[PDB]
């Protein structure tokens, strides 16, 4: 259980951080996805057999 | 008129050839492939961890 508490916080920082599941309302800085998303800078992968460079 | 091979036929031993004699090999491998377990009885239980916080 020792082992399982602290490997459990180390879990909910990295989700908070890169997604922004369950991020602190306080933090008012953008999750790693969100910066990006509402930047625009989201790319697709297609299914073209990278002829279309996707 | 002559001796042929049916007159001689007592006098004409075959040979015998190993060339194409073999036993079964032991072909078998998941006792040397996987992690061996020497057991005791018939049963063992194996804990494993299911579910975490």
């Known amino acids: 259980l020792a082992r399982m508490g602290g490997a ?12 922004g599941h369950q991020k ?3 933090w ?8 990006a998303d509402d930047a625009g800078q989201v790319v697709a992968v297609g299914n073209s057999n990278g002829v279309e460079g996707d | 008129a002559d001796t ?3 007159d ?3 006098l004409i031993q075959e040979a015998y ?3 194409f004699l073999d036993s079964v ?3 078998a491998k998941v006792i040397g492939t996987f992690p061996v ?8 239980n194996l804990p494993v961890l299911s579910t975490f916080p």
């Open chain 1, 28 to 35: 008012a800085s953008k999750s790693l996805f969100e910066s």
């Open chain 2, 25 to 27: 090999s032991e072909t």
């Open chain 1, 8 to 19: 459990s916080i180390g879990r909910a920082l990295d989700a908070a951080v890169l997604f």
């Open chain 1, 24 to 26: 602190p309302v306080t």
């Open chain 2, 37 to 44: 377990y020497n057991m005791g009885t018939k049963t063992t």
């Open chain 2, 17 to 19: 050839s190993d060339v």
């Open chain 2, 4 to 6: 042929n091979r049916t």
């Open chain 2, 8 to 10: 001689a036929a007592a």
